[PDB]
Design a binder for this molecule. Sequence first.
Ligand code: PLP
Ligand code: PLP
Lengths: 396, 396
Amino acid sequence: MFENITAAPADPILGLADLFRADERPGKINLGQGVYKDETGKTPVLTSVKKAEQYLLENETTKNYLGIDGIPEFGRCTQELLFGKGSALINDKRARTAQTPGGTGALRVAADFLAKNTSVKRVWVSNPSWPNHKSVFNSAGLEVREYAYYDAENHTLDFDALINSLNEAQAGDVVLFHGCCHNPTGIDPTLEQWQTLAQLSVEKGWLPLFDFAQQGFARGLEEDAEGLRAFAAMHKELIVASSYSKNFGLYNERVGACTLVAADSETVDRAFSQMKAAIYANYSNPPAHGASVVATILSNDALRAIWEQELTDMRQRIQRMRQLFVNTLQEKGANRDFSFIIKQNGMFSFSGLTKEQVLRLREEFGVYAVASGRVNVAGMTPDNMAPLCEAIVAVL
Amino acid sequence: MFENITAAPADPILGLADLFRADERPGKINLGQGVYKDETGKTPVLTSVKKAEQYLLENETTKNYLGIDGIPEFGRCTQELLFGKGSALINDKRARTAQTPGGTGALRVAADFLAKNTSVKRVWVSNPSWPNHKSVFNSAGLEVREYAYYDAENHTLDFDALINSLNEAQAGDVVLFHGCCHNPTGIDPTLEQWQTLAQLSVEKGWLPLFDFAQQGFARGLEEDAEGLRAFAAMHKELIVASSYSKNFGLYNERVGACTLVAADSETVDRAFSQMKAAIYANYSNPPAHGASVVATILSNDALRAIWEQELTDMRQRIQRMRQLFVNTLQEKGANRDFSFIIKQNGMFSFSGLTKEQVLRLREEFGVYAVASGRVNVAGMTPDNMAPLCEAIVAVL
Ligand SMILES: *Cc1c(COP(=O)(O)O)cnc(C)c1O
Ligand SMILES: *Cc1c(COP(=O)(O)O)cnc(C)c1O
């Protein structure tokens, strides 16, 4: 059976990770990873999370199965984070939320649900996008198509080209939007631009699908949801894949959610039952620990306050690195204006380096980035900025 | 899009659970659930698990992603549990193990892997089987077919009928075996019978797929793997879906494994790369906490010793309930000989009650079992045995 199975392609993300480990050079710098890093260069457990875990250690009396859709309070808190306290969506009971193993899990559950219960045949993703999106949808049996997004000249959202491209999208197609902190470009639509896309979406007949991987990393928790909420006000139908991997630092505990919005309670409840069917045939029910940590934090005034400041501290450190990066390149003799980096949002930023410049940065200077030129800004610190920028300037 | 979506069928397992909650009667007895219960009627966290969780609370410094295949030590311990310390399979490096979200997750990952990389078109499951098997394989796009198993007259393994039925299976078909503690019948093959099926499987050309949900609930950890190991000695190719839900009491943390066996290291490593691809497009990587608890326990001499005795205590309490049940029915005037219950293994047992007897037991006497007549023996205690058996005798 397995004699002639074709190997999976190498995978450059794991390859980059392994080449970074083997690199015996002491001044090596990793900007190719997907996780947050602090001023010391590590991915720590949040203080709020540790406190939540201690409480669970002390008060859990059973590990009996969660329901297919997971911890109710988790779903309730997730819906308030996405739509806001006073949302009409929540009030009319139009939204149903499944706890899932991470954002990826939420995308996959969304994909299986649509492929098995709707007429959806294809999904539209940005160019570039996170490469995991394509694989997830393709596995459910959905075609992936690309719409234009990145203006390579101005390091901006090519908005005219984005509209032009999506006009090819038929009614009943899914169109995937990154709620905030676009991966890999860090380029987000403005509110006016979100409102325009919301309007275009309703008349063109798209099912919008929002991927929220970094809620709270752009401007703030509420601000980063504005785009979503603009779509929410316009649309009858909507899906959201959200992740707490980055904003709670719970990557390996697989904490995410799939939220289904329909016109009314009877419809959403009926659609959601088939979404639960898609979860039952996949992993049966979701993992409790990570999601229980999140629900414990968000429903407790003290822990939430502590957590929100931790998230704010991450957001601001990134924003300090963005500026320090631009100023350091400026004063190191930068063959280029990098001021666009400051206007980009969140973990990631397209540096605009060529694949050869990137490959050279690794070979000569021990600086690791992704082939596309994506850099993780959280991998930058005050200590490694000088040598990072010297390397970059030397390859321009 | 969601306007005319057909609702999912009610689901009787959740329906049974909800009807049990609403039941205001004080003497109600639940035998319809899938989880272990102790003498007090609860599903507690194991002492070994709590100790493991405390150690993790104190020593974890990051929640950074696990690899796609999860915690290495977890995989190593899982392979020793399945194949044994000195196994040649482990020595020749023929087995590769992915940590997965529960046994269900392992079945789904197995299913996607086979559907996408082999010529497998159908899977053979026992009659009856756990209904989740059918849904999982059907979602990957695989036909499910049934082979005979249960001898309804003698409450035994209808072995002649089992062989006769599986002769319909073509070469290149998957045949699913329950390693031990068959769900729902509790009827396992003897070693001689396992050796016979192993032999038949190799000449007929089946890819065997083992589902281990209750390793350690029949006779012991090593004993319950004999069937698997008999197949392992004969076969070049094999898949195992194992679960730590029941034997570590970690149900909601989703702790399982998919283990792939091929002829040699180069083949298994190449096949496993595509299995990792199937995980990447599903939930990206597995949840750490539950699997970290398992790895921490199994790799530590003290905690493992404590855990093994906890598992032994569960196995023996079940075996005491089996006997108490038969003796109590005998001395309550049983219209029937229930001695077959004592020879059946693990959590579950087919009582041999009709769906009307079951429905009547719930309506009149507040005793809850599954429509098929499956009873969870761990739901029986010394306190509720008398009233349980009185109800049963009254409906025969
Ligand atoms: C990091 C990231 C995620 C996170 O996925 P999890 O499964 O939640 O770890 C999801 N989507 C995007 C675009 C991301 O960048
Ligand atoms: C209980 C059981 C399982 C457990 O599934 P998890 O996903 O590990 O909870 C798997 N297979 C069978 C036959 C079972 O009875």
